[PDB]
């Protein structure tokens, strides 16, 4: 979603 936050490769929240 648009709320997504990608911390690093293969690791995204929301």
């Amino acid at each position, epitope marked *: 979603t648009k709320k997504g936050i*990608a911390i690093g490769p293969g690791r995204t929240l929301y």
Partner: antibody
Amino acid sequence: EVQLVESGGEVKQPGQSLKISCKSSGYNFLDSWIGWVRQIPGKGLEWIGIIYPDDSDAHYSPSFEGQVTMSVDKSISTAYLQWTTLQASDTGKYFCTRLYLFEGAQSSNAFDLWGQGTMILVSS
Amino acid sequence: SYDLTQPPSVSVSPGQTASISCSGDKLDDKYVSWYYQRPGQSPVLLMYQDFKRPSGIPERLSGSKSGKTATLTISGTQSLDEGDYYCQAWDASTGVSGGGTKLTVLFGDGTRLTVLG
């Protein structure tokens, strides 16, 4: 234009309450996280927290948690930072910023938009 | 959570390349972003996802990462390049008693670039 405009600088006494604002324009306010960062004159950037305007979901820095509160008023595209009781250690330039979600080959985020800052001086 | 370490200062001669490091325990698997800040002004995004430049940022500026160290490289340095540079990354973890993932924005202490003009 796409920007964040913050409220004016203020001199406050310790013990006083305070609420500063950040008005967003130029993009869909509800869909991008808003971050807050403090910078003591001559020092580095200190993260305060982030809040998602659409639902007010929030993440705070342990250093600022319970000391300040983040909120938003969706109707006027404004984000706020508020204190119940100020301390001299709250002195500093406060910036609000927008976390942009780059929808490229791989997704990633970065604070691409920054307000002009609000200087808060807490002194007796 | 992990600390991000940056050299407090970097000096370079005009036209030469300057490199600014940023080290952190989880950086090897965390995207790094870089910001520029001129005295009295607001920060400006220079790089994200380790090596990506947002629109308008010149090609002479590049970002990379090796192991737990991210590096911002400025080639063809000029006097106007002076100022502070900050690296930034994230940390994510779930509390032992639940409550969903907790996010943390991490900033390096900053590096002041000096261009010997």
